[PDB]
Amino acid sequence: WDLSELPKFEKNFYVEHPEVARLTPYEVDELRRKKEITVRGGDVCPKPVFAFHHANFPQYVMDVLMDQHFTEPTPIQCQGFPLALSGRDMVGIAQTGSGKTLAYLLPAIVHINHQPYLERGDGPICLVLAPTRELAQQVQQVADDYGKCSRLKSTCIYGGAPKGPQIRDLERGVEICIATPGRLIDFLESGKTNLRRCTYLVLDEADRMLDMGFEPQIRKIVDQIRPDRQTLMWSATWPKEVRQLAEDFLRDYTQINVGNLELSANHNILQIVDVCMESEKDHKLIQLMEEIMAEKENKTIIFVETKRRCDDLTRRMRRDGWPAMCIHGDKSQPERDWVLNEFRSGKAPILIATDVASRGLDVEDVKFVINYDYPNSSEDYVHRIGRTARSTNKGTAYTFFTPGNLKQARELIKVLEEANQAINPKLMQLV
RNA sequence: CACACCU
Ligand SMILES: Nc1ncnc2c1ncn2[C@@H]1O[C@H](COP(=O)(O)OP(=O)(O)O)[C@@H](O)[C@H]1O
Ligand code: BEF
Ligand SMILES: [Mg+2]
Ligand SMILES: [Mg+2]
Ligand SMILES: [Mg+2]
Ligand SMILES: [Mg+2]
């Protein structure tokens, strides 16, 4: 890898606060227990922090945090901030809506602030990879909230939008780059950016990015980054099947978890499962929507199995005067952007979507998630229902489960049991 | 598979 030709750089600038350093090992274990933090046995890991002022942040960042009325770091932030700041490779697993984005973005800003300034021809220092274009844009917006107080520049690299403005941003110079894989691979092959200064690599939704469709794109990208980079992977779900594969992209790494070690949903979601025949779904949906739309807070996402079903259900509902719009991978990117912005603003309270909208999206005031079709996996179920109940908010999920979904019943029951939810007897009868 | 993911 030309182990001596590369420039030098530093990774660990973490200074442990005296309020944290004083904790004995037992006291640290009790703090972790109280926050439901588990650090994998045998890994190197700093003590968790428990206040924002422990976390080495620039005063600008603290000012933005206070302006947003953020009082206390979330559990994944409590353990992830110091681990990331220490420069260690890591995997950070915590519930949907629990703050993983800032868990990796704020240490990225510290990391960047300790490196020499970008010159001309310099690629990004921090690269974040995400599975959908809308999620990449959302993460870039979060980053801009905080990097803009320093003079940190960011961009979003993603398909479906003109290449020209993205090439401009990359050539002007960005310290932070958020990307979906395809457009980035395109730009790397054609020399529009490079990863020779990339020392902080984030895989968000990491188990999705390591799946059959994404893993070869990830491999193509990461094979171009120096192996002394820091790599940080994050997700609400971390199935055993991705763990060995993940080691291809990690070095001397540490795994941390919040909540139960098994597959688990956000416990602020009320989870309802309606066992019914496929032919009943239409009527049941309308019944449900009539209830939902009678309430003052009624913003709703309806998930379906295919782009064709998403289009068809949306036409069927709009023809009855329902204010529904849809997002899926066959729409143009300007249309996808417009529909999601209309949903965010509340101008359209019903979003019908494929799994393009299942991960990462943080939309204010979603109160209902409806699985019109049960998803492809129990992990996808956990992510979908996590579009509600963000941060401290509560939410409700309704799922239509048919006999054709029988093979997925066992794991669904386990998820429902882990969350202390009431199980529909028809679901148990299925097994 | 779906579903995402450059052109
Ligand atoms: N320490 C905190 N206190 C309160 N809210 C927070 C905190 N950290 C993040 N949030 C908010 O929680 C919401 C969900 O965060 P996000 O990073 O999207 O969750 P995740 O990536 O874990 O699914 C965001 O609106 C974010 O602004
Ligand atoms: F897990 Be969060 F919904 F990205
Ligand atoms: Mg390491
Ligand atoms: Mg490292
Ligand atoms: Mg879990
Ligand atoms: Mg997220």
Pick the CATH number of A269-430 from 2.40.50.140, 3.40.50.1370, 3.40.50.300, 1.20.950.20: 3.40.50.300
**Distances, alpha carbon A37 to alpha carbons A59, A240, A353, in Å:** 27, 19, 33
Length of chain A: 431
Phi, psi of A80, deg, nearest 5: -75, -40
Token pair listed for A67: 């302006």
- Cβ distance A155 to A203 under 8 Å? no
Alpha helices (runs of H) in A296-377, residue ranges in sequence order = 307-318, 333-345
Handedness of CA A94, A125, A81, A72 (dihedral sign): negative
Q: How far does the CA of A266 sit from the C1' of B4, in Å? A: 23
Alpha helices (runs of H) in A190-319, residue ranges in sequence order = 206-209, 215-222, 243-246, 281-292, 307-318
- Cβ distance A267 to A317 under 8 Å? no
- Kindly report, as residue ranges, where domains of CATH 3.40.50.300 are found in chain A: 18-258, 269-430
Sheet arrangement for strand A395-401: A269-275, A395-401, A368-371, A300-303, A350-353, A324-327
Token pair listed for A288: 């449900």
| Amino acid whose CA is nearest the C1' of B7 | A186
Cα A306 to Cα A310: distance, rounded to the nearest angstrom: 6
Handedness of CA A253, A58, A106, A24 (dihedral sign): positive
Cα A132 to Cα A191: distance, rounded to the nearest angstrom: 23
Residue type, A292: I
Element (H, E) at A425: helix A425-430
Q: Determination method here?
A: X-ray
Which residue, judged by its Cα, is nearest atom 1 of ligand 2? A96
SS3 track for A13-57:
CCCCCHHHHCCCHHHHHHHHHHHCEEECCCCCCCCCCCCHHHCCC
Q: Within 13 Å and on the Cβ side, how many CA atoms surround A336?
A: 21
Residue A279 is classified by DSSP as G
Helix (H, G, I), strand (E, B) or coil at A277: coil
Contact partners, residue A207, CB within 8 Å, separation at least 6: A235, A237, A238, A239, A242, A379
Strand B contacted by A345 CB (< 7 A): no
Token pair listed for A351: 């979003």
Q: Could you identify the residue written with the tokens 């188990």?
A: A207
What is the best residue among A76, A100, A238 to mutate for testing ligand 2's pocket, by most ligand atoms within 8 Å of CB?
A100
Q: Could you identify the residue written with the tokens 């291809």?
A: A248
Nearest to A373 by CA among A358, A386, A348, A354: A354
CATH of domain A18-258: 3.40.50.300
Residue type, A65: L
Q: Is the shortest distance between the CB of A360 and ligand 2 below 6 Å? A: yes
Burial class (CB within 10 angstroms; exposed 0-12, middle 13-18, buried 19+) of A33: exposed
Contact partners, residue A264, CB within 8 Å, separation at least 6: A95, A382, A415, A418, A419
- Cβ distance A6 to A30 under 8 Å? no
Token pair listed for A373: 């079709």
Helix (H, G, I), strand (E, B) or coil at A198: coil
Cα A336 to Cα A333: distance, rounded to the nearest angstrom: 5
Strand B contacted by A53 CB (< 7 A): no
How many Å lie between the centroid of ligand 1 and the Cα of residue A183? 27
Contact partners, residue A101, CB within 8 Å, separation at least 6: A139, A142, A204, A362
Rounded CA Rg of chain A: 22
